[PDB]
Amino acid sequence: SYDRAITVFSPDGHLFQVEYAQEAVKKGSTAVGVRGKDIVVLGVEKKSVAKLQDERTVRKICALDDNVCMAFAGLTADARIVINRARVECQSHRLTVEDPVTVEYITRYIASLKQRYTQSNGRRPFGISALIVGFDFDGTPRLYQTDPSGTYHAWKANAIGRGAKSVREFLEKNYTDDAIETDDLTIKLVIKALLEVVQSGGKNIELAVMRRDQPLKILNPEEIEKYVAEIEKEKEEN
């Protein structure tokens, strides 16, 4: 077996390998999640598909369990490993314990997995950050995010990838009850914050929404383009 320490401390006290993995996520496609009142919605971008490529395959919104879904940014090949490890863990928590996974627990596992890859021999850290969206069994909405280091926090709204600094700053200015009042305006809030950084066009936007008790919904490029119309009718006018 390969027993070399890959991730080690620098003289200044830096984990370069973990920091390089954070450079990989910053090169990743724009991903934004926001918690509403009744629903939670994710949105993912920098899609840039050749239109010669079938896009059903390159979808960055993944469901981990019945009540949990996630979005990622960075090395998409790494993400697939993490996602399927989390999917296996979702079914094991269901076998060891009757209860379905809490959002915080699955986030904690994914975080513990990434952390383990920063302190174990023979392996490099994962090159992805995750945004985890789900509902509690009591119904209170939950949004979390992780990074290559292994740290996780809960967010009201957040962005990762390229244009994260730009979109994040937008969310701080635009996150009030006037925007969260309805279910429609929260979806609109994602699209607006999304269309704010991407090479414009609702054709490059795949976003998912899930209501308190409803199964996960991936939206029609019809439904989202209908909302892109309510932004352009209220952009030249407003």
Partner: protein, 233 residues
């Protein structure tokens, strides 16, 4: 390029000294050992008002009578904390009693320099933990506070601070400590020193406060209770 178990000409392990440096980037945490209890306090370091307040947990519960303040690489700490929690419950199972604060700290200190490359397991450690820990609690030797760093070295403290502003808070505790301090003055002092060494103003949602006193168990402070101790500035 060298190995992880290499000695400096000085006489220290590089990876350990570098792990000490990683803590100097972590948010500051203070513990105070009062004759009538132990108080732990830490700054959260909010990066955005979008981040959830109670989401960051830099002071956690290990046992009914033990609290742990953490600084440095948070992700490294929570692996060590689970190990601390596992040890207490293994000990409870085997001996039907609560562990001493010294033994709990000693248990975590055993994982110290258990890292390496060759002549090791597949899942053996590649590096040390970029974390410092303050174990504060009450056992049959009264109230106690212990400090631990990546060298494995652990020692009791009457009062200690660790993090980015370590020396500044250390001097502030030095001239403001009586071994006869009350718990009212203990929480106050930690709150007074915290605002001085920080880049952000002290809010009720900005910090975590914890008490372990003989009578009652480890307690996580609620926002309303924080507003009563921040009332006396």
């Amino acid at each position: 390029d060298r190995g992880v178990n290499t000695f400096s000409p000085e006489g220290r392990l590089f990876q350990v000294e570098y792990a000490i440096e990683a803590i100097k980037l972590g948010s500051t945490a203070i513990g105070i050992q009062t004759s009538e209890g132990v108080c732990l306090a830490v700054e959260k370091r909010i990066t955005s008002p979008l981040m959830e307040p109670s989401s960051i947990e830099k002071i956690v519960e290990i046992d009914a009578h033990i609290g742990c303040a953490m600084s440095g690489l948070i992700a490294d700490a929570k692996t060590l904390i689970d190990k601390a929690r596992v040890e207490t419950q293994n000990h409870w199972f085997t001996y039907n009693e609560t562990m001493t604060v010294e033994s709990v700290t000693q248990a975590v200190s055993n994982l110290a320099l258990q890292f390496g490359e060759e002549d090791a397991d597949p899942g053996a450690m590649s590096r040390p933990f970029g974390v410092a820990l303050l174990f504060g609690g009450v056992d049959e030797k009264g109230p106690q506070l212990f400090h631990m760093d990546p060298s494995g070295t652990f020692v009791q403290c009457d009062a200690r601070a660790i993090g980015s502003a370590s020396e500044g808070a250390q001097s502030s505790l030095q001239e403001v400590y009586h071994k006869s301090m009350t718990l009212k003055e203990a929480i106050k002092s930690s709150l007074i020193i915290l605002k001085q060494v920080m880049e952000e103003k002290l809010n009720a949602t900005n910090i975590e406060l914890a008490t372990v006193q003989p009578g009652q168990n480890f307690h996580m402070f609620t926002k309303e209770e924080l507003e009563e101790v921040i009332k006396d500035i």
